[PDB]
């Protein structure tokens, strides 16, 4: 968990970081879907719990730089990421 | 009178293939469609500004 760990839950295959979830499935509910109609919450077949599946490749990146004719120093801007999560 | 709309950007490979490495490996040989779309959207954004 908390890593890019491929998962095959009851024949449903995916890739992502598994995290503990606060959503409350109904007793018969198995899979969770988002606005995107893509799997976002899953229920562990062995232990009755709910797991969120965030992506492995999350965090926009861009490179501010003056012309290489001038200097080679660059700065990095991570889009939409709080400064304590890098 | 409207002036500018919302500036949007796309990550071509992430949207197309998600987190499947083999999907990206298969994708890289369709050419430079992703580069074209990134360039077009960046042009739209700078035009809005």
């Amino acid at each position: 968990k908390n890593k890019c760990v491929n998962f095959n839950f009851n024949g449903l295959k995916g890739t992502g970081v598994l995290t503990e979830s606060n959503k409350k499935f109904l007793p018969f509910q198995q899979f969770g879907r988002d606005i995107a109609d893509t799997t976002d919450a899953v229920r562990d077949p062995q232990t009755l719990e709910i797991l969120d599946i965030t992506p492995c490749s999350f965090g926009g990146v861009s490179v501010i730089t003056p012309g290489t004719n001038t200097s080679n120093q660059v700065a990095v801007l991570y889009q939409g990421v709080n400064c304590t999560e890098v | 009178l409207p002036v500018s709309m919302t500036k949007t950007s796309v990550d071509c490979t992430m949207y197309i293939c998600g987190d499947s490495t083999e999907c990206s490996n298969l994708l890289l040989q369709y050419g430079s469609f992703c580069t074209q779309l990134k360039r077009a959207l960046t042009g739209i954004a700078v035009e809005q500004d």
Partner: peptide
Amino acid sequence: NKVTKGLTVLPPLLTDEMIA
């Protein structure tokens, strides 16, 4: 007050304060 994944929304260069 009268006006209300792979895809990102970039903020505008000029904030509403500078436009005001």
